[PDB]
Design a protein around this ligand. Structure first.
Ligand SMILES: C/C(=C\CNc1ncnc2[nH]cnc12)CO
Ligand SMILES: C/C(=C\CNc1ncnc2[nH]cnc12)CO
Length: 151
């Protein structure tokens, strides 16, 4: 049954700048900020909203070499976006379910809170590399790299 992991980070960026890159402008940015993992991102169906499907192609050394994710929620007024891994990536490493929801809120003009909810499951005992204590660390690293990209 699906379990949850929650964490958060405060970033020294304006909410609207972080929202744009997180929710809309990430196609060219992901490979630039994660050049040690992500080669490119392809938008393959949809126009950026719910149902949009993305392929992340990873570096040649990486197995699986890609991950397919779908935007499963998108709310512009509450600044929430959710992405579910639907093929490859963690699903090829022992997970049966993996979704990441980001919600932004303004702390001050140049401080933005990002709440991160990870939902996941696995049918058997799993390796550390797919524990959400570990997967969340990768996600927080990406968020802090966006902050740096924007600064
Ligand atoms: C395109 C976006 C996020 C991309 N996907 C992920 N971003 C950060 N950590 C993850 N873990 C699994 N999938 C992800 C939002 O900018
Ligand atoms: C299973 C793999 C990567 C997990 N996916 C991600 N890992 C780290 N950052 C990301 N941004 C978007 N997707 C990811 C490939 O080794």
């Amino acid at each position: 049954m699906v379990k949850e992991f929650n964490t958060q980070t405060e970033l020294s960026v304006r909410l609207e700048a972080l929202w744009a890159v997180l929710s809309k402008d990430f196609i060219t940015v992901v490979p630039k900020v994660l050049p040690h993992i992500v080669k490119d991102v392809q938008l393959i169906e949809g126009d950026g909203g719910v149902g949009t499907i993305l392929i992340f192609n990873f570096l040649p050394e990486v197995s699986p070499s890609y991950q397919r994710e779908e935007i499963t929620e998108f709310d512009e007024s509450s600044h929430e976006i959710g992405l579910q891994v639907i093929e490859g990536g963690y699903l090829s490493q022992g997970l049966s379910y993996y979704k990441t929801t980001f919600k932004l809120s303004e702390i001050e003009e140049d401080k933005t809170l990002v709440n991160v909810k990870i939902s996941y499951d696995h049918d058997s005992d799993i390796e550390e590399k797919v524990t959400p204590t570990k997967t969340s660390q990768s996600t927080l690293m990406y968020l802090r790299r966006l902050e740096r990209y924007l600064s």
